[PDB]
Amino acid sequence: HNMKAFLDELKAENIKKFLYNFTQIPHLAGTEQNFQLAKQIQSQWKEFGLDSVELAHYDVLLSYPNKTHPNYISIINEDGNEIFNTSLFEPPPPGYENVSDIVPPFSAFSPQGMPEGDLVYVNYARTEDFFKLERDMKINCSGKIVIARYGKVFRGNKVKNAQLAGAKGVILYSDPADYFAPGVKSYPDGWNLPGGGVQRGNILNLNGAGDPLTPGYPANEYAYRRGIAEAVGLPSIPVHPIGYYDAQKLLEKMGGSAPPDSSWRGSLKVPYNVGPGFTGNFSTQKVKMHIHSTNEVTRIYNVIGTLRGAVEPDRYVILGGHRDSWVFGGIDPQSGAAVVHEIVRSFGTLKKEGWRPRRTILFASWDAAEFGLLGSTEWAEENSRLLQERGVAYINADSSIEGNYTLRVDCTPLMYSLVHNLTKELKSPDEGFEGKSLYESWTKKSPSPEFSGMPRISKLGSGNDFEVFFQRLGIASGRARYTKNWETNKFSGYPLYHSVYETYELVEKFYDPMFKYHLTVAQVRGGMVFELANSIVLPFDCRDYAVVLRKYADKIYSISMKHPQEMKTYSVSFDSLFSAVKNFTEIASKFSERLQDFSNPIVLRMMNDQLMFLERAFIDPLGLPDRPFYRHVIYAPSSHNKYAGESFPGIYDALFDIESKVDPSKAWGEVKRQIYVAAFTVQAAAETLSEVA
Amino acid sequence: HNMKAFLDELKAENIKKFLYNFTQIPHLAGTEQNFQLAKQIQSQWKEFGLDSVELAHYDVLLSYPNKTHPNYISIINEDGNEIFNTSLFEPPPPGYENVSDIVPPFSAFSPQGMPEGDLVYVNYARTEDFFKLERDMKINCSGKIVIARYGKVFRGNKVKNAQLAGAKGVILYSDPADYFAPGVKSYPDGWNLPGGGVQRGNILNLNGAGDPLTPGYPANEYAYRRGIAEAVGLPSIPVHPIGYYDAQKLLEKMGGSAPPDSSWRGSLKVPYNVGPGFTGNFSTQKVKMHIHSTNEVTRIYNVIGTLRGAVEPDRYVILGGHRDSWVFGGIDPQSGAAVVHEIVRSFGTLKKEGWRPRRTILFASWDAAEFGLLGSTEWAEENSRLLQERGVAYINADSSIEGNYTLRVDCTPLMYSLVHNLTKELKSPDEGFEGKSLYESWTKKSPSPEFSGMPRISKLGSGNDFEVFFQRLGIASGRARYTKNWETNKFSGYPLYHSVYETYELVEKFYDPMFKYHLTVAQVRGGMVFELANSIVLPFDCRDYAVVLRKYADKIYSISMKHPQEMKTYSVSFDSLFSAVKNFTEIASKFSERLQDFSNPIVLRMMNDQLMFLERAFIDPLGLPDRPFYRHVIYAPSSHNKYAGESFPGIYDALFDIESKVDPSKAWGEVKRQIYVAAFTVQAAAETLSEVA
Numbered sequence A, B: 001h002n003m004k005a006f007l008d009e010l011k012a013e014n015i016k017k018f019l020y021n022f023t024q025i026p027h028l029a030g031t032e033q034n035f036q037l038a039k040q041i042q043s044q045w046k047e048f049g050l051d052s053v054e055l056a057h058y059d060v061l062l063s064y065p066n067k068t069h070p071n072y073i074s075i076i077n078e079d080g081n082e083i084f085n086t087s088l089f090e091p092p093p094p095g096y097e098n099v100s101d102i103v104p105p106f107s108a109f110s111p112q113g114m115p116e117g118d119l120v121y122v123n124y125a126r127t128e129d130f131f132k133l134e135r136d137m138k139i140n141c142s143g144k145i146v147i148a149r150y151g152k153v154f155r156g157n158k159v160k161n162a163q164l165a166g167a168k169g170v171i172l173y174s175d176p177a178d179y180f181a182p183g184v185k186s187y188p189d190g191w192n193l194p195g196g197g198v199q200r201g202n203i204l205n206l207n208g209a210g211d212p213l214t215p216g217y218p219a220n221e222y223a224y225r226r227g228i229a230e231a232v233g234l235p236s237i238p239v240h241p242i243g244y245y246d247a248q249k250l251l252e253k254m255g256g257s258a259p260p261d262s263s264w265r266g267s268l269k270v271p272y273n274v275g276p277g278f279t280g281n282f283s284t285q286k287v288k289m290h291i292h293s294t295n296e297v298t299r300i301y302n303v304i305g306t307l308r309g310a311v312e313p314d315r316y317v318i319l320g321g322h323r324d325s326w327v328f329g330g331i332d333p334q335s336g337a338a339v340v341h342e343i344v345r346s347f348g349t350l351k352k353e354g355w356r357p358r359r360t361i362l363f364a365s366w367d368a369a370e371f372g373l374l375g376s377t378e379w380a381e382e383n384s385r386l387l388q389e390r391g392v393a394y395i396n397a398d399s400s401i402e403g404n405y406t407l408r409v410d411c412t413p414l415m416y417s418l419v420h421n422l423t424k425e426l427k428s429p430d431e432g433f434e435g436k437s438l439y440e441s442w443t444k445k446s447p448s449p450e451f452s453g454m455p456r457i458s459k460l461g462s463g464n465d466f467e468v469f470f471q472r473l474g475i476a477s478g479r480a481r482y483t484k485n486w487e488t489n490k491f492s493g494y495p496l497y498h499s500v501y502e503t504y505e506l507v508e509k510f511y512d513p514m515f516k517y518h519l520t521v522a523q524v525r526g527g528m529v530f531e532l533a534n535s536i537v538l539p540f541d542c543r544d545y546a547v548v549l550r551k552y553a554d555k556i557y558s559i560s561m562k563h564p565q566e567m568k569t570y571s572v573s574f575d576s577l578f579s580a581v582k583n584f585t586e587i588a589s590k591f592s593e594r595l596q597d598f599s600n601p602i603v604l605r606m607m608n609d610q611l612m613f614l615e616r617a618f619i620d621p622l623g624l625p626d627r628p629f630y631r632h633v634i635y636a637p638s639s640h641n642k643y644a645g646e647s648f649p650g651i652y653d654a655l656f657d658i659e660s661k662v663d664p665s666k667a668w669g670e671v672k673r674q675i676y677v678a679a680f681t682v683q684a685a686a687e688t689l690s691e692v693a
């Protein structure tokens, strides 16, 4: 019973069977079908051999369309006649045209409204897109309906940006530029998005809060709930998503200003005029939204499985991923959930033969991730004290594949060495790399920008269920999946994301017919869990944090140095931060020497506790400015794009667009404050690795 | 080498020698004399045998009078002639009339000003005193100078209360009712306060923040400081303290309304009229303050001594107390510091013979406690991650004696059993109890109100250096001293508190000539430290927390039940809190069974970690409303009196004066919210004692 036994037990055919089983009907959060799937998973995890498997339920704010009053958008003439209406549903794929309970496309948590007005096209609705409109083009979005293409940033940030620009509504659409790869056919013939396809997704700005009504505390049976007016993260203006057939109709009549440059033009046969409003002949026509969705407190269910550790049962290694889907969840999340299911099965086979991991492994099937990471966050709020003092690591397990090209890993620097070592042990599934390691194929296909002979590993961003564990609680986190070639494919994500077309057949026909990429991902996620739960010394290398901290310090200093006059005027010095990073580097090096130079289980566990609490040391209990649930001082989700990670976020946000601030003395004062907080936190984290007494 | 060896090594004569040594000159925070004492203590602790002894320095906001522009109060006539002036200094005691650098009486952190106006007498300036004035007597304090007697509550709360009433200045004075015990002579002939004596003390409202300029972060060399206008806790109106000779002069001419009842009358031969202003003949005279004190960022020095643990060096038991004094510090703090010095000496004697404690013991000589617990708080801010994950317990060590009658202990319920057991082992020093235990004499003199045959142990309040450890960080804390008979003595504290008269001679002549009460206190504080640092299983009994939680729940429910109509209207239920307390009781009972029923050092340490993190579990990382550094959900300093502890403070403050709130729906909503937070926290703490997996 070693890692090889665990790995060898994983089977592609099992992952295939589980994926098929999980994707025959929709599993929307808060629905009966998703409760039944939770009960099935609970039963199977018990069968598979886990020590305990429970459901943890919460009552959280969810959002659904009104089944008898559908959402749609119109072009309306001056008489009030609706002369064009957007679709009421996506044409269902072959053999699913009789499937019931497919939720039609909608933006979850949109308020109700029927706003009428003139359109302004805002490109991707990024911060810089709105800068270009108001500052350079002098276009006023106030009282306008904005139309934005999906892509580049999280859609909740688009909506926040549109609100702040004074928009009265937002229309989101999928442009073929961003969702249709040249030379591939539309579903069901290929993996591209058809013109009737639409991307569902929530538009909250929760900043880590979890259920909008219960920030800080689990939404249990006696929870006190905020009123809707005080809820966290809800949009103030109606929002609705459409496909590119419907978008073309809305965009084709657009007048006003030309697009400012080619980066504003998608691939539709329209001019991409910014507006406001339509060209001369249609100038009296307007666009009207009709949104009737309702927010409702609804029960959700996480499944929590425990495999008790033999030696350190009070140390938890957690493998978690969500179960709820927008429709069938063929990739998101069931390609991930099928992998977790097979990993549980494999650990359980070893357990039945008398083996136990050194540390406790917790397995989680989270609910309501699509509605704002609600299930993972409520459970972590409930269990924060246990997780704070006992949580070794969290490995996420959403979608296993978004392409068939190479591995994609995002994780804390503490797991870099673990990932390098594990992938050197695993077989590459790639064509042309038979008999070579996964490390070799991954490194060849995705080279590190910094280091020759090393693969790319990214920072954690957000938009997935590791957020509460990593940026709120400070537990070392990672994730891994298979991805496309991010060089020859300028579309980002996979085209059928959050559409009805994301099915079992999509995966089996077009992504991974042999389930070998799924198997490789199971080996990586499972292998990481195995090493974290079984290695005598925790498999974290603090020296890797020292390297990245210096990179991040150089980066933030370089941003500040675009303003040398102000740094002179306000005596803005990064000396303290570089000093702290130098100290961290020195102390980490000495700790590493002791770790290899120390029979003594107290010294071991003392050292294991130092390793475990190192990620924890980057937590500031006061949080980042106006984002109390983003507490990690090194990493936070970008304030402009929840999906992307930002390093030294407190300093970064203090410097962002600083030349536009009215009171530079105050603005640079806050930069200095954030430098002090970051330097202090880095030094304090370093000192947790010093000799204890 | 056992506890008896440690205890036997402590000597009364050594404590006496150290007290004499520490009290010959003033040791005001931020002065050269106090830096030299820090260096002396550092040297001696090294000599005594500690493994390391360092100074930890910070630059914090302090406050001092202007040496060339003294503070005083006048009665001024209508021409502007100052016809009476308060004293510029306390008459120095015999043999100290040539001691230099005695700081004259002042209220630390008072702003500057020369406000003139009519006096209003506000009794003790408590919340209920101001309720009586504005609500019942219809007296408006707006634009008035208020005069308040010291006593009952922390003087910072008096000042906050006066500010909120619209006062333009505050005069604090010591009334013989509260500071002159009948039948005892004034210093130097007895231990009473003479009419020229004055109580110094800060008037901040920091709510746990530490240095006013750096809340959250240590005031190190690169710290970013708030501007004075954004500083935490500073008073907005000038304040100055006086003795009762000067008070009588200010009060004797008072007119307006009679005092409302006898509880408003002190012992001076004046009517105790409330005012405003003086009686007819003197109606045109006014009172004028002259305050010229300055706030200045000043270096302070903590001494930190380490005695490395033999088995668990990464577990810290901390004995700390302050070193800075207002003048000579004969009782406060040097009676405590001399005890710590002898405890260090004794542990060091054992260490020189080859002994080490199981766990690390840290010893601390804190600076600037008199200015707001600044030294302990800055050091805990610096070291919060180490303390959070490694801090077993904190034992405070301020004044060892305030009387000669019996023991006084305040501590977490987790230490009740430890204190009972230890005091049963120790000899009573009391006359009439020769050959009996300290437990016996203490229990006889200070019986528990709840339980026959048990001594009184109080909740921790605040006003001392355990605050950051206990209410911010959630580390189990306690304190012990000798006290007066709190039945036959209606004066509270000791009369010479914070006066120039608090000297070595005061202690040696009047309080403890044989230093036997000091020795008993050294045995209690030292014995607690010894058991915490050496016992195989941490000496905490979680079942004692369960008992008190039920008492506190009954108490808060009874407060709410004074409003049955509102509890019906707003569906205010305490069911969740009682459920959580019942669950805590059940789980704690089961944990206790396992603790006694479990050779295995991992199970032991797992269980020791459960014991250590139990106090930690009562911490809410969001803090209490508007008091982010009071994070403990069971205990906080009273919002009306920093010295007193309040239980379930969040619910208590939500219920306080609720019948006066304009929007009862909102007010009772907040009561329910606080019930939810408290029930959740109690359940979450209980669950940390459940089986870990």
Ligand SMILES: *[C@@H]1O[C@H](CO)[C@@H](O[C@@H]2O[C@H](CO)[C@@H](O[C@@H]3O[C@H](CO)[C@@H](O)[C@H](O[C@H]4O[C@H](CO)[C@@H](O)[C@H](O)[C@@H]4O)[C@@H]3O)[C@H](O)[C@H]2NC(C)=O)[C@H](O)[C@H]1NC(C)=O
Pocket: A576, A577, A579, A580, A583, A679, A680, A683, B221
């Ligand atoms: C990284 O680690 C290093 C230790 O290897 C650590 O060095 C520390 O730096 C501080 C800040 O420089 C030093 O602080 C000094 O301490 C002495 C007493 O030991 C004081 O006298 C100094 O103050 C005087 O000088 C100041 C500067 O001109 C004046 O502003 C001040 O008014 C005084 O005149 C000063 O406080 C400290 O001694 C070292 N500690 C060591 C070497 O052990 C460094 O701080 C770490 N980096 C970070 C970001 O923490």
Ligand SMILES: *[C@@H]1O[C@H](CO)[C@@H](O[C@@H]2O[C@H](CO)[C@@H](O[C@@H]3O[C@H](CO)[C@@H](O)[C@H](O[C@H]4O[C@H](CO)[C@@H](O)[C@H](O)[C@@H]4O)[C@@H]3O)[C@H](O)[C@H]2NC(C)=O)[C@H](O)[C@H]1NC(C)=O
Pocket: A221, B576, B577, B579, B580, B583, B679, B680, B683
């Ligand atoms: C103290 O410990 C006890 C456990 O010994 C713990 O008991 C738990 O109480 C909660 C709240 O009552 C129970 O929650 C129920 O769970 C079931 C499923 O197991 C649900 O079906 C229930 O919901 C239905 O009924 C509700 C009440 O009428 C409705 O409001 C709701 O809409 C549903 O109809 C309900 O959620 C839970 O099962 C037990 N757990 C046990 C017994 O293990 C108690 O909560 C603890 N106290 C505190 C303060 O935590």
Ligand SMILES: Nc1nc2ncc(CNc3ccc(C(=O)N[C@@H](CCC(=O)N[C@@H](CCC(=O)O)C(=O)O)C(=O)O)cc3)nc2c(=O)[nH]1
Pocket: A152, A201, A202, A332, A369, A370, A371, A372, A373, A398, A408, A461, A462, A463, A464, A483, A484, A485, A486, A492, A493, A494, A642, A643, A644
């Ligand atoms: N090989 C490769 N490299 C990349 N590098 C950079 C980028 C930049 N763009 C993105 C980066 C990350 C994401 C992302 O992490 N998306 C999430 C989306 C999961 C999700 O649907 N979450 C819900 C809930 C989110 C929430 O409420 O927080 C939602 O977004 O609707 C994920 O895949 O984990 C999206 C865009 N994309 C890629 C890429 O596609 N491939």
Ligand SMILES: Nc1nc2ncc(CNc3ccc(C(=O)N[C@@H](CCC(=O)N[C@@H](CCC(=O)O)C(=O)O)C(=O)O)cc3)nc2c(=O)[nH]1
Pocket: B152, B201, B202, B332, B369, B370, B371, B372, B373, B398, B408, B461, B462, B463, B464, B483, B484, B485, B486, B492, B493, B494, B642, B643, B644
């Ligand atoms: N046997 C006995 N029982 C009592 N029970 C209840 C009370 C109620 N009144 C008080 C309770 C506690 C205190 C108190 O704890 N005072 C502090 C004062 C220490 C001090 O001077 N601290 C500074 C700084 C405080 C700060 O900034 O927070 C100050 O108050 O000026 C202490 O002795 O620990 C004061 C009044 N008093 C007594 C009592 O005197 N004796």
Ligand SMILES: *[C@@H]1O[C@H](CO)[C@@H](O[C@@H]2O[C@H](CO)[C@@H](O)[C@H](O)[C@H]2NC(C)=O)[C@H](O)[C@H]1NC(C)=O
Pocket: A021, A022, A024, A039, A040, A043, A044
């Ligand atoms: C997914 O697989 C599960 C597990 O095999 C299937 O649930 C079982 O169905 C059989 C036949 O109806 C029952 O006898 C068992 O009690 C079920 N086991 C459970 C729920 O643990 C389920 O039918 C499959 N779903 C699909 C869509 O194929």
Ligand SMILES: *[C@@H]1O[C@H](CO)[C@@H](O[C@@H]2O[C@H](CO)[C@@H](O)[C@H](O)[C@H]2NC(C)=O)[C@H](O)[C@H]1NC(C)=O
Pocket: A074, A080, A081, A082, A083, A084, A085
């Ligand atoms: C777009 O949809 C609307 C709503 O169903 C259609 O307008 C309705 O048409 C019916 C029948 O002509 C009328 O009785 C309703 O009063 C109309 N409702 C509204 C809100 O106008 C409209 O015909 C559709 N337009 C197109 C081009 O299909």
Ligand SMILES: *[C@@H]1O[C@H](CO)[C@@H](O[C@@H]2O[C@H](CO)[C@@H](O)[C@H](O)[C@H]2NC(C)=O)[C@H](O)[C@H]1NC(C)=O
Pocket: A417, A418, A421, A538, A539, A540, A541, A596
């Ligand atoms: C990744 O693999 C490397 C190579 O085996 C590990 O580094 C070795 O660790 C052993 C045991 O401490 C040392 O004796 C060697 O000197 C190390 N070799 C090096 C640094 O080149 C490394 O520890 C592994 N990383 C993890 C997280 O397990």
Ligand SMILES: *[C@@H]1O[C@H](CO)[C@@H](O[C@@H]2O[C@H](CO)[C@@H](O)[C@H](O)[C@H]2NC(C)=O)[C@H](O)[C@H]1NC(C)=O
Pocket: B021, B022, B024, B039, B040, B043, B044
């Ligand atoms: C308090 O005691 C200390 C320790 O004995 C005295 O400081 C010593 O003074 C002698 C004689 O001046 C020196 O030789 C030593 O170097 C000092 N030792 C130290 C500072 O550790 C100090 O004089 C005493 N203070 C008073 C007021 O009596």
Ligand SMILES: *[C@@H]1O[C@H](CO)[C@@H](O[C@@H]2O[C@H](CO)[C@@H](O)[C@H](O)[C@H]2NC(C)=O)[C@H](O)[C@H]1NC(C)=O
Pocket: B074, B080, B081, B082, B083, B084, B085
């Ligand atoms: C109270 O103190 C003040 C300040 O010292 C005294 O008033 C001063 O008296 C001198 C000499 O007569 C004058 O030159 C100053 O102009 C006065 N200053 C002020 C502010 O009035 C006053 O005499 C003292 N009163 C008593 C009764 O001692």
Ligand SMILES: *[C@@H]1O[C@H](CO)[C@@H](O[C@@H]2O[C@H](CO)[C@@H](O)[C@H](O)[C@H]2NC(C)=O)[C@H](O)[C@H]1NC(C)=O
Pocket: B417, B418, B421, B538, B539, B540, B541, B596
């Ligand atoms: C205080 O002393 C009591 C009495 O010795 C301790 O309680 C005993 O503990 C032992 C060892 O676990 C048990 O065998 C006995 O049954 C206990 N006696 C009782 C409960 O009456 C108690 O543990 C001590 N408290 C502390 C904190 O050490």
Ligand SMILES: *[C@@H]1O[C@H](CO)[C@@H](O)[C@H](O)[C@H]1NC(C)=O
Pocket: A066, A067, A068, A069, A294
């Ligand atoms: C949905 O719309 C229907 C019919 O137009 C209405 O009767 C019902 O109240 C709505 N349901 C909601 C708001 O949940």
Ligand SMILES: *[C@@H]1O[C@H](CO)[C@@H](O)[C@H](O)[C@H]1NC(C)=O
Pocket: A140, A141, A142, A143
């Ligand atoms: C945009 O439009 C509205 C008028 O409808 C106006 O109140 C607002 O100030 C305008 N903003 C700018 C920047 O022109």
Ligand SMILES: *[C@@H]1O[C@H](CO)[C@@H](O)[C@H](O)[C@H]1NC(C)=O
Pocket: A191, A402, A403, A404, A484, A510, A511
């Ligand atoms: C799978 O790989 C092949 C060969 O590189 C490629 O042509 C195809 O686009 C890939 N399929 C998907 C869904 O990425």
Ligand SMILES: *[C@@H]1O[C@H](CO)[C@@H](O)[C@H](O)[C@H]1NC(C)=O
Pocket: B066, B067, B068, B069, B294
């Ligand atoms: C104190 O008062 C003197 C003389 O009245 C003045 O010159 C000096 O500025 C003051 N010192 C301060 C404010 O620190």
Ligand SMILES: *[C@@H]1O[C@H](CO)[C@@H](O)[C@H](O)[C@H]1NC(C)=O
Pocket: B140, B141, B142, B143
């Ligand atoms: C108290 O006095 C001032 C007038 O000097 C007034 O503004 C204030 O409203 C008064 N308050 C009450 C409660 O009478």
Ligand SMILES: *[C@@H]1O[C@H](CO)[C@@H](O)[C@H](O)[C@H]1NC(C)=O
Pocket: B191, B402, B403, B404, B484, B510, B511
């Ligand atoms: C010491 O005890 C005696 C006898 O009870 C008492 O008369 C005296 O007041 C005490 N001294 C002090 C300072 O409390």
